[PDB]
Amino acid sequence: SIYPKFRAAAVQAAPIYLNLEASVEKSCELIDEAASNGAKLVAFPEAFLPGYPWFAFIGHPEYTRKFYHELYKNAVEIPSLAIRKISEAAKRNETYVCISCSEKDGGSLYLAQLWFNPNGDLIGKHRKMRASVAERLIWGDGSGSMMPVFQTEIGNLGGLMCWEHQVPLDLMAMNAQNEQVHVASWPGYFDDEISSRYYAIATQTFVLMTSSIYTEEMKEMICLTQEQRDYFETFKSGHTCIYGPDGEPISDMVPAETEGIAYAEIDVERVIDYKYYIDPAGHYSNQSLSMNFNQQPTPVVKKLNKQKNEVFTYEDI
Amino acid sequence: SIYPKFRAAAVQAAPIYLNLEASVEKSCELIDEAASNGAKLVAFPEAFLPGYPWFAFIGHPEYTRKFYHELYKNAVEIPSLAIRKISEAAKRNETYVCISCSEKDGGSLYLAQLWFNPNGDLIGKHRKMRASVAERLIWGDGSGSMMPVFQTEIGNLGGLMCWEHQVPLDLMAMNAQNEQVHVASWPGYFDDEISSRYYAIATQTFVLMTSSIYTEEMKEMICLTQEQRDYFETFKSGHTCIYGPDGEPISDMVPAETEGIAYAEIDVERVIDYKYYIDPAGHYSNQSLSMNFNQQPTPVVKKLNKQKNEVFTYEDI
Amino acid sequence: SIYPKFRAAAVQAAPIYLNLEASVEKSCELIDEAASNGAKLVAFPEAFLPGYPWFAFIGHPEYTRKFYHELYKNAVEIPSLAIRKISEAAKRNETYVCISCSEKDGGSLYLAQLWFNPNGDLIGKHRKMRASVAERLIWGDGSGSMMPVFQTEIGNLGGLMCWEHQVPLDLMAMNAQNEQVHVASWPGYFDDEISSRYYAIATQTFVLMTSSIYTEEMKEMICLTQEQRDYFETFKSGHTCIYGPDGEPISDMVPAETEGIAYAEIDVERVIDYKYYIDPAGHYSNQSLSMNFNQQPTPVVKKLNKQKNEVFTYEDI
Amino acid sequence: SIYPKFRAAAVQAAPIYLNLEASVEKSCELIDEAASNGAKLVAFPEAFLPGYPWFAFIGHPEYTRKFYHELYKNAVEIPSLAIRKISEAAKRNETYVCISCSEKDGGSLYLAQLWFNPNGDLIGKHRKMRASVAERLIWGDGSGSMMPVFQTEIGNLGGLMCWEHQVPLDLMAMNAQNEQVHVASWPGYFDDEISSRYYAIATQTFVLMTSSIYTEEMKEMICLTQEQRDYFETFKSGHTCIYGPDGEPISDMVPAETEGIAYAEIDVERVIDYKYYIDPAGHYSNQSLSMNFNQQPTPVVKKLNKQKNEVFTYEDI
Amino acid sequence: SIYPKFRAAAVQAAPIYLNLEASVEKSCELIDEAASNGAKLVAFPEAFLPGYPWFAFIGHPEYTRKFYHELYKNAVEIPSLAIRKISEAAKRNETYVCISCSEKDGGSLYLAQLWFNPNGDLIGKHRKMRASVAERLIWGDGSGSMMPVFQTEIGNLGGLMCWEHQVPLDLMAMNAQNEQVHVASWPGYFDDEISSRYYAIATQTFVLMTSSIYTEEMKEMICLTQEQRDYFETFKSGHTCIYGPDGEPISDMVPAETEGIAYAEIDVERVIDYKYYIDPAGHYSNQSLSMNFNQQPTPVVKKLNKQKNEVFTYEDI
Amino acid sequence: SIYPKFRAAAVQAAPIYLNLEASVEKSCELIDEAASNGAKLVAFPEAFLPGYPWFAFIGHPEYTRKFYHELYKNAVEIPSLAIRKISEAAKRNETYVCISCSEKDGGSLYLAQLWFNPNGDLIGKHRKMRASVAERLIWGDGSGSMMPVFQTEIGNLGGLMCWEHQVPLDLMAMNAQNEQVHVASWPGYFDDEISSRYYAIATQTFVLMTSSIYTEEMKEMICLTQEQRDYFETFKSGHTCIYGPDGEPISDMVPAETEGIAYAEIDVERVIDYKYYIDPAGHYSNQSLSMNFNQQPTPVVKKLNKQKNEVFTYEDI
């Protein structure tokens, strides 16, 4: 029950497309750059580590099958070198970090947000509940047991990705847990300055809207024909900004498609002035409408009492 | 998280019926033959070392009692000479070996697959979970603690025996462990082309399908009367082949009852193109259907704090 | 517990693409044709009534957004004239009917199999558990409450669609309810001879595999350019046949893409001989592996105690 | 805690082979025969209703496959007319009845003992925990949740079938529930005196040992050849007697293969004199040896929240 | 895994009552008798060496206190002359010997079975797990550390005393260790042919049943009053016989309660023919019922790091 | 950590021998008598409810057989009318009660101390750890999980029975739990004054010593002969008294073999003056000597997941 005051940073950038190793070091450089200015929280746009699958939108599924190979080879398993590097970066600069990636758990990929701690440990993970229009060909669905809210030294943190903001049930689920600071991860194509502002208004929290940008090498490796190139050249871009609990901006929007970072002074004490008006899960409720939030871990196959098997060594035999 | 390339061998042959030592030397010779051609994985047909109990299918239980004696005297206990011979064979040719036998563990027999490692150590064992129609008179059942998948230098290996392929729960248990190369041990009497191809399709794996053959010297001791002989003369044969992740053959099927070996170049990186379509334990899942894989060791009688007792020697007294 | 003998027909045909009104009358004529030869059970290939969304495979999502308009307009709602006419046809010929169609319930489309009694009543419905690679764009997912198996005058009927045969948990769910006759619905593109035969072997049932075909009028509207026409020309067709409990054909496979119907004589008494060997949900089970089948109805929003409100008419006011 | 005194009847008889309908009326008239002499508890030999499958012991499994058809057709599903008739008979004569039958649940057969109250209700069921030898071809296995002991007006009742008396863990499971009267169901082929006498001595209970007999009409159909006839003619018969808590007979044993009934005056007060000496699950125990008894129900597929579904009748459409 | 063939001797005799030094002479005199006939295994009755405490059954606890004096002073300390004389008797005749005695360890008496190798070394010991009825006033209890099964050159040997055969958990502990030849020590009073015969079939072992006899000189010291003399004259005598794995005697038992020895040709390989039928700890097991066997040594006071302390001799001081 | 002051009562009385119903009402009237004088804790002598088995000491086991019947029929099961009456008595007077009885659990009797709360609830139970010389024919042993010390409004309470005071490990186990008030249950025959005072001195507690008395009606049914009558006439009686933390009496001892109650004012503040001197489980300890207290529940058979099975009523069938 604390109301801290800190400095936040929302990073707008693009990775080295479908190259995990280079993206990790670029992310570490960005973390160091943002922390050097005094940020206590750093957020990254979306699917930042391997890269967002734009190929899934400009070709038929059999064409997407070619690049699914490269995306699969560059995924981020939870015990991995990429996570070790990002943990080192988070601890070195003593900042919370929220970086999203194409996690793989078994034989399938998922889109996850990995949360780190000034101590450098992975405090949680959030999987996307449903994939968007063409993301359904790439990532699987999540579960209700992976929508955490972390009580930390900088308030109750949380986040959502892309069109998770247009589903009122997720808004209610996050409001139930008393979120105070929100990280909104977006790609560049979709319209994001209306969902994030409304989320800030309705849930009464600061929102760090982060968006990605398009590089030339991405287009070179993605677009094969001229029709694909001229179709992909018409994709718009998303903006990066920080919003207050009332929905008005509190920072300076990153000016254009160029790389940049937006800083703001977040005073969690200010959300109280707006909890006075509307609280959807509190005083501003009706007994007729309710919600069920089942959050049991529900993997397809549950394994119990797994023990370690012995090996009869060559000397033993 | 590796996707190697290697050469696989699927051995088709028949043992010296109900004679352990002759079968063991034959197995070693076959392993050397397969290795001399460059194979990195050698798979053996079924119940190979003593021989498959065909007597149980062509006579009443009191007739099968006569041959249960000979089968029992030729069983393979885990510490034994046969296992050390196979270990030497595996280490000498630096190949993985998957050979099945009628394991003896205590008072009765079990059918097990033994997995050997290029260093010559028995990396694991797998017991059949349920004996087929007439095999219920010979072997006991296995457990869930003995369905391992080995993460090795040539991918994630595994296997099942005979009609374990027609139990969907075993398919789910194996798929939940992310298996990539599968060994399908079959005898000669059952139809095995549909089950193996479907398994390859539905688990996205390379399936080494191995089957045994009949010998006249076997019929000399198995069949006693002319009715038994003419009944056993109608048993169909089993084929040997290697299938790709899509179920289509990638090798040359062994032509006929003739003893032989089938070779293929297995590239584990080709399963990624098919995880894109279907993944039963991953993205292709529904929250309403689930599974419980309880894999605790469940022997009939657990012994704790096993101790070695003292002996008062004749000199001592 | 009855074991009837009856004649069944498997229909291979294609509709008037994306035209519900013509497709319904076409299906009625096909039902009359099948019933005039003595068939007591008529099955239909897949997504028959409006047609299968082939456009989703040969173009990027923005190209599919246009054809989604026409597909949505021609969808089937349960209280509609399509069901009216199909029920009339079923009662007229006193036969069971299994027709698949793109049902719509609310603002979203689903793919369902509709079952009609000889009296003409819609005895049940079954939504596809999860769409395949490219149909994720078009249809939503079903739930466990919609996997019925119907006890009828001709056995225990049931059915699945397309790749629901490659999900072992679906096989177990259907088997646990003691199915006897299975209707497999396929489109032409995918390989279906292995999945259906394996399903027949594993579940010990008669499988009526039905597959659609490509019309020349469909390519007129689906293919807009030459790079799409040449690609769509390479889509292979599917086969239609009826299989016995052992996976061996019991009818004459429809010879080619030409529209036709396959007839077979089904003797449900024959499944008992093959329940003697294997019963995955019965005696051929293990206690370490078990399945959970939660069949609670789970819509997103549950509406309770709804009533018919009153409206004050003009004369009243 | 009550120690009643009553009269018991142990029945020696054989059914009309594989003729469930006639066997049921035979068993009913036998219940009236036993009750008209004052018997308060009636027990039947084993697998009485359809008939014990002797065909599995005198031929190869491909020959048992034929008679499995007839056995399957005559199996007893719990909601059946056979149970209706047996309940009517039990209520009519106000006696406890213990009848064994080849129960069928789904697609598989099981061997069960059905217990009926004097009120006519089915108080419990007990499935055999493991089939013996050739029985494994016919029946599945039970579980731990189906080993009940019933507190009744005539003491604590219970029972086991055939070789369940040679498994010490079954003895311990029954002893831990404080059984007082035991019904031992036996076929005629095995040696039953020693096992039942030892069970009576070790568990300190009265044992009603019932055994079946061979009819000529059974051999006229089971033995197809002369070798099988001469082989089956050598099967020894089983005895029928009632034993005391000390293993000494307390009734005149049924003399020979002739059908008959054995009567005894059971006085459950007498077991106290022998609980004085030994009580394996009580004062005669050691802390180093222990037993684990898991009584959870373990069906292969668990179904939750089953709800009856609606059908849109013809008039509605 | 060896299956030898040898001759076994089951000795029936009575000791010189409560005279340890005189019974040890008789024991050796009887080992020579059996060995000179070709016996390779000699078994003796219960509490043979000092004598069995019959006084505990025919008088109140204060009358028994007088005779506990004589029994206590004739107990067998493990390092003692009684064991030295029996140790050299085994090596002199090169036979295995199993002799029961009233061991004393510390300040209390225990009932133990001592096993001697053909080389004369005490290979193991087995304490009774629980005294029977009146024996509770004389002997303490054993533990799980004292239930050994010896792998020898004549099979796997084991033993139990008196009512340890009626405790089903004791049967499972020995069966868990794969015993093949059993020695059943009984005194005269109890009924033994029923528990020992069942143990043969329930465990598939040859059983050497040895029993004691009543002497006239035993009744002189035991029976004081005439009321005791007539009561002690109604004690039924035991029997000595050897049973096969079938449960049927293989030797002509001793003619009566005189002194004699029974011989048999034990062939261990034929226990295989009965492991085919039933194996409680192996293939004939159900996962619901299991047992725990904690075989840690559990003395009341555990001592560690016992050392040697010096004595300062009169010369040193 | 409270140190209350209250009044305690130690009861000397005898029950109506082997008659539970009369003994219970006698106990209730004694509790009322004690409470009417202000007593806040009432303790009862030994095995009170059915009566102590004196027959075991004056006759051989076959004579004790007869009276074991009457003892068994009068045993106190935990859900019984005797416990209901005792709880009613305890709540009606609002006093703590400690009563010993021959509990039965299953087919075996146990000797237990039952503890009741001023609210009338059975707060705990304590089975005797080991039965005395002739009590071994009657009662079984307890375990380590049934040695509780209850933290109450009148201090920490506990108790032991008879020769459990001569076992130093019991003293240490009670000391480790910080007992403050102790109830020593004794029968008449043994010597009790020396052990109770030593327990008080060694554990620094107030000891309520209670003992029984021989009645004339008991000898009529116990002593069947004159040799038994004159022998039983020599048994010496016990003493009832209350001792301080130093073994010095703090109350007037009940004079002779007469029913009576001893009253004392107990001030638990006085144990502090004696924890100053010695505390065996505390500051007065040595690292060389240690004790293990394994207090897991160890019933012979453990039952898991017990559930209530359904019954099909007559109407349903």
Short mmCIF file of N, CA and C in Angstrom, two decimals, chain B residues 36 42 82 106 131 173 178 197 203 241 251 276 281 285-286:
data_model
loop_
_atom_site.label_atom_id
_atom_site.label_comp_id
_atom_site.label_asym_id
_atom_site.label_seq_id
_atom_site.Cartn_x
_atom_site.Cartn_y
_atom_site.Cartn_z
N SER B 36 29.07 -50.27 -40.34
CA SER B 36 30.04 -50.22 -41.42
C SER B 36 29.54 -49.40 -42.60
N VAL B 42 20.69 -47.57 -34.93
CA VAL B 42 20.30 -48.90 -35.38
C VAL B 42 19.12 -49.35 -34.53
N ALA B 82 24.41 -60.66 -21.84
CA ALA B 82 23.86 -60.14 -23.09
C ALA B 82 23.95 -58.62 -23.13
N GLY B 106 12.71 -60.05 -11.27
CA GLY B 106 12.07 -60.71 -10.14
C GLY B 106 11.51 -62.06 -10.54
N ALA B 131 0.12 -55.81 -22.71
CA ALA B 131 0.42 -56.86 -23.67
C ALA B 131 -0.74 -57.07 -24.63
N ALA B 173 1.14 -38.92 -24.55
CA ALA B 173 2.23 -38.93 -23.58
C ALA B 173 3.57 -38.71 -24.27
N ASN B 178 7.95 -33.82 -26.54
CA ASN B 178 8.66 -33.25 -27.69
C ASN B 178 9.65 -34.25 -28.29
N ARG B 197 2.62 -44.89 -40.11
CA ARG B 197 2.47 -43.68 -40.92
C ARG B 197 1.61 -42.65 -40.22
N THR B 203 2.49 -37.00 -34.89
CA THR B 203 3.49 -36.53 -33.94
C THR B 203 4.62 -35.76 -34.61
N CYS B 241 10.51 -49.99 -43.09
CA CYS B 241 10.68 -48.76 -43.85
C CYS B 241 10.89 -47.61 -42.87
N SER B 251 12.76 -43.80 -47.59
CA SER B 251 13.78 -44.80 -47.82
C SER B 251 13.23 -45.87 -48.74
N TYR B 276 4.28 -26.31 -38.07
CA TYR B 276 3.53 -25.15 -38.52
C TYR B 276 2.06 -25.48 -38.71
N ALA B 281 -0.20 -31.16 -28.78
CA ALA B 281 0.09 -30.75 -27.41
C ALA B 281 0.43 -29.28 -27.29
N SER B 285 -4.62 -27.11 -29.41
CA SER B 285 -5.16 -27.66 -28.18
C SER B 285 -6.47 -26.96 -27.83
N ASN B 286 -7.30 -27.68 -27.07
CA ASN B 286 -8.56 -27.15 -26.57
C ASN B 286 -8.58 -27.29 -25.06
#
